[PDB]
């Protein structure tokens with residue numbers, strides 16, 4: 001089964017409100033995955049034991065934390081999968097995605113910043129020499145803009161649709177317009 005990584009290396013950038021939002025978005029994402037008959041194997045990487053995120057899950061969502069269908073680890077995506085197979089997703093990337101690939105491990109940053117902290121994830125990728133891509137939002141949604149920095153549950157639904165052989169118009173229905 002194809003892995004999909006949520007990178008938990010952003011905790012230091014967030015306040016109590018935004019960390020909470022991140023946790024809400026991750027729970028929602030795992031739920032969309034459980035609905036699908038051809039799901040991803042979800043990995044929570046860089047999840048520091050007894051950090052703010054792990055503590056938030058354990059103190060405030062213990063019942064829900066014990067039943068998620070995923071693998072969580074302190075290790076990095078680069079410690080587990082070969083660098084050649086990694087693609088870090090970020091709206092700041094200069095490479096526009098054209099093709100969903102079944103032999104790649106996509107990485108999504110676990111970060112709610114309200115577009116106030118650009119480049120953050122692009123740099124975390126460059127520093128380890130990882131390939132990056134952005135979603136083709138301009139190409140397939142001229143005007144209707146909104147902000148191009150989507151939520152974590154939006155990203156998984158798009159990628160699920162493409163994984164299950166949907167075209168770009170179908171996949172991008174999950175993007176709120178205006």
Ligand SMILES: C[S@@+](CC[C@H](N)C(=O)[O-])C[C@H]1O[C@@H](n2cnc3c(N)ncnc32)[C@H](O)[C@@H]1O
Pocket residue numbers: 089090091107108109110111112113114115116117118119120121122133134135137148149150151152155
């Ligand atoms: C709210 S965004 C975070 C924006 C943050 N300032 C950053 O530096 O990425 C949440 C995550 O979803 C992914 N993402 C969001 N919108 C995307 C897009 N248009 N293309 C590719 N990845 C996207 C990225 O992995 C990003 O880390």
